[PDB]
Symmetry: D2
């Protein structure tokens, strides 16, 4: 029988989502110093088990449906992150790295790339950020110069997830149709493209495959452009609008792992003639952890449910990503504190979570970017109401 106190009972969810949640949890329980090899193995395993189909749009191209089920992608990342940051990362990048193709690819492009993404035989990547511009996407400087039937790419992308091991990169570059955000085009760039160089492998506090890409006159056929020339900025933004809610879901999963560790330690740690959990400060701290988790989860699945009605979720996805990532930091930090010295011992669950969560407040748009999106949207909506 359905536990009506579980979040899966919320009417944001359909029965298929409850079955999916049980299925991915069982996969995690049964299947979960070399992050490159681990990523490759996880992509293959998740692909063979069918879990990468949810991040791809189009049944003809290997997707679960013709739309991307945001609630499903979120439940997958939430459950994976609750067990393994590496497994979450692997599934996430098959979505984010292929999303621009689901959204904007031709028939040939969707046929060539999406089935292999969906079955885990091609590793995807999303190459937007640059050393000098991550938040300020509209001012990117990687250039794409038209030369006959190809574009010639020159410059650098960096912080690129799966960099060095991806089979292709969706690359955004300045083609120059108009200034700023109106001068960008999107390309699918196969990893074996001559002139695409892995300039540096990047180490971060919670290790994942990351690289700086240097484009040294790399030639990309015009037929590899996603969408129309100069329409690449909106494609990047629309791809991020899908998967920002999934970053919120991963944050939530990390927080749920910390919550489980924290309540177990509160119950088991004997001190002062009782247990840690018998103290009011512990009870109030656990309560706030749980409150943050429930508010995060409600925001995540409100946004995912809304996108699954066919609606734009620029505001609601930003809210979810902001709240869940900032909140998960607080939950994880509290769980570290409950563990005392063991909370900073290398390789304990909460020590790993303390490292894992920090980047989620930065990638797919930093917290401060999300806040300004929401604040600007509030004033835009008020101005529209005043007009009418």
């Amino acid at each position: 029988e359905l536990d009506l106190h579980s979040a899966l009972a919320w009417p944001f969810f359909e029965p298929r989502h409850r079955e999916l949640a049980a299925g991915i949890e069982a996969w995690c329980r049964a299947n979960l110093e070399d992050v490159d090899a681990t990523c490759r193995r996880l992509v293959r395993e998740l692909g063979a088990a069918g879990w990468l189909k949810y991040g791809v749009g189009g049944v003809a191209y290997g997707g679960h449906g013709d739309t991307i089920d945001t609630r499903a992608v979120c439940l997958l990342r939430e459950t994976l992150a609750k067990h393994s940051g590496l497994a979450d990362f692997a599934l996430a990048m098959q979505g984010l790295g292929s999303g621009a193709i689901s959204l904007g690819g031709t028939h040939e492009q969707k046929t060539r790339y999406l089935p292999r993404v969906a079955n885990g035989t091609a590793i995807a990547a999303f190459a937007l950020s640059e050393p000098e511009a991550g938040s300020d996407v509209a001012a990117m400087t990687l250039s794409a110069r038209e030369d006959g039937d190809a574009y010639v790419l020159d410059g650098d992308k960096t912080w690129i997830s799966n960099g060095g091991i991806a089979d292709f990169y969706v690359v955004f570059a300045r083609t120059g149709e108009a200034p700023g955000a109106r001068g960008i085009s999107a390309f699918v760039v196969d990893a074996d493209t001559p002139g695409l160089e892995i300039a540096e492998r990047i180490d971060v506090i919670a290790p994942h495959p990351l690289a700086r890409l240097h484009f040294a006159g790399a030639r990309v056929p015009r037929s590899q452009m996603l969408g129309a020339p100069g329409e690449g900025f909106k494609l990047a933004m629309r791809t991020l609008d899908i998967f920002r809610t999934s970053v919120a879901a991963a944050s939530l999963g990390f927080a749920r792992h910390a919550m489980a560790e924290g309540v177990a330690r509160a119950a088991s740690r004997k001190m002062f003639g009782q247990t840690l959990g018998d103290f009011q400060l512990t009870q109030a701290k656990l309560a706030q952890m749980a409150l943050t988790i429930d508010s995060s989860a409600l925001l995540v699945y409100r946004a995912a449910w809304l996108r699954d009605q066919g609606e734009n979720v620029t505001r609601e996805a930003a809210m979810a990503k902001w709240h869940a990532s900032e909140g998960a930091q607080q939950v994880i930090d509290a769980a570290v504190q409950l563990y005392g010295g063991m909370g900073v011992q290398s390789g304990t669950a909460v020590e790993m979570l303390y490292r894992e969560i920090r980047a989620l407040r930065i990638y797919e748009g930093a917290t401060e970017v999300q806040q300004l999106i929401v604040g600007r949207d509030l004033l835009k909506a008020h101005a529209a109401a005043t007009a009418g």
Copy 2:
């Protein structure tokens, strides 16, 4: 056409809730455009329009349904509070003050009291707290001594909403069957009971009808007891449980009023060659206000939806009341700041909200009590899982 970005589109709501939300908003616009006199008027107007029926249980007794639709009660309080703290208070007390009769009354008691509560011709009140015992209800000292066919009541209740204007008070008193929480009984005490004295009117920062009640040997018939002797504590707690999420909903309504004031002021206040809303600090503050409101609203209506499925919501309602009241304080405080000096000018919308919100963090389970409820429940659930 349903705006799919509106909270009313959430699947926590049924079609009847969307119709109700439009109806109570229309009533507010038509009717909210001497505190005791205002409350009396509001109760009668809400009653005549049908809005007090939602807080009464039992169609036979004037209620909207045989169960209380807590999503409906929440939407009513949220909408009323967004327009007027007094209007929210008037509806809220008709619910809280009669809830113990809906839960525990006999057929005669329900017939005698609930139809007049539901049509706004009897003002209800809930008399639990005492000068020395508010949070610690189990230690109350108001005594009820059995004497023939009546009980004799001696002692004080205080902080009693609608004190002095109520037509009856649901009074919880120690009958002494067992120590502490096991020795309390509940009574419906008519305002005209000899020995029931309105001892002092209480002034609070957001003025509402409030009084200290002194019981000077007030004789209450045994047939006015609600439930069995010694079962009054559970009745008080279950009555408060009905309306807990609706206190969160009122907080949310106050926050939404503050948000509307803040956004409008940010857009309209010219300064430094632009508007206040053009500054990043303003945009970030407005964004946090909106985030707090959406998280509060989701917590309120998750809890209300869950209770309406027939489930106990100890943890979820505590989360809603805690988050919405603490969050509304923050939203209101930010709106005061956006208004500058006008934010503390008496009678401006945001100055009134700054006063109105403060008590909601204190009554019906102070924030600190809500934290402990949630924390203890987390540990209880973990113990059950590991057993």
Copy 3:
């Protein structure tokens, strides 16, 4: 014997400050055991007769305590007064703020005419800068002052004017038009009996103090009543506010100390659940945070006051003090309200009055947000100077 754990033992203080602190506390106990106008008039007279208004006036020859203003002394006076009575603090504060522009920029005649009467409490001072459309943005004020022979003709409105309606004179800042914006403002001492000066309305705020909107209907002000040179009024206003900025922080601190005393006493005395409120961990942690905020605020206040008294500009330090003490006092007072339960919102209890009293101190004399920007800009300015 000096209690070495008391803040007055800090080496930020000199012996004279310890003596003053005892004196003003004694005065409060003897004199501070409805009709706000009459109360303020009485408090100004009593503070004046006791010698306490001399510390906010510059120049021994003009009734001041010293030829410079002893900021540490003014802070201790406001801190102590506010700890007992918001009205008494207000009375002393406005004798300083309302006369500071004369201490700074008056001629010998102007200082002799006004400052001795401010210092002995026989003239109530006021500072008229803000306007309905220009509070934070002082440089855009629109009250006009037109030269006409031996006088200036003033037209327009000031508002939120403390002591408005009961002041004997107003230091008014008006646009004389020598140059745009902040460079076209002049300052005038305007006696309350000036024909054309009208009390347009009395203003009611949440913690009632005498306040008014002033309307100037062609008020002719003698040219000899100008403070400083034409067009130099803006810097005079800013320097006048600068004198007393730390003292607003000190008042905030005094309100917080009152709330702290109320909270600890209630925690100790309120019986509940077979013990006292103070026996609960949440109460102990809350009291501890109140005390931490108070000590941090006090250290920031008197660091800034000590530094100014060394002859140094304290742009960053005074902004930090006013920001931290006012925001922190709000938190301390809010926690004390919570400890009192229903009594915390009962009209006229100590903590209910403090909840109303503190709110405006975060808004006037540079709102919190303005203080944050002052500090942030100064950090960047100092960094630029270091790397130049």
Copy 4:
């Protein structure tokens, strides 16, 4: 000349502290441009340069003075931490690890141990915590059984800084004179004691030498006891009371490093046609970082100055340690955020600080322990005032 805006100008400091601050900064620039080997080298270098003398009490035993100059130890840790967590740790443990000997040793014990601590040829350690008892010191279970002229020690200590490389351990053990906190004695245990085993080397998120010690019937001569039997708990608490303020100082130094990184990045990072520092959110963030640093520093040096008057600082040291460690976490976290993706890049200054700070909220008494110390002290002082 003395920059009067510098914290070193505060009257909490004497001229010798300003010269010491300059001297240790110069040492850092000249010397900090295998973790076990690194710590051994740092202890030797700091000892040879004279900097370990400040943590030792008694001129006859190699100390700088007959008292421990708290302000000096704090300035040393603050400056070292601002450059290197390893160097801070090395100096800190020469203090904490020998403090019980400075406080409670006989002439013979001080002569044997302190001169080599002070010149860096003996590495000290403080062995109090146990796997089952860290916060709840009074319930420790390591047993010391008297047997002739020696005590036989059995059990484990853990989280022991310098474990595995220390030359001696000050070990607190239950001798059983009375229950709980009244049954503990202190011993100096040479590292070569038979029956003392380094059972496990411990890895933490910011690596420092750490071990679990196992005592398997280790015979410790009675002459190695510090103080009287059963008086060991107070000796442990008094040792922590000295150095808790120095943990606050180290926290402050880490925060100052993060502040320097953050303001530099704000000034240099171009974005959106300007720099990161031109945005209000950045200015307010930097302002709050600076406010937290100044309030932390004021609390640190108020506590250090007060202890250096000969006064107990249980409340003031707890306040400093709590505020500075929690505040430094916030400052460092903000600096990570300002750096974007580079903020989590391994080995960058701010990424290292994010790992370094986390343990300081846990060791020498967790934040929650400090809050309860302060809260209980407020109620104790109120009860004493009521009684008087």
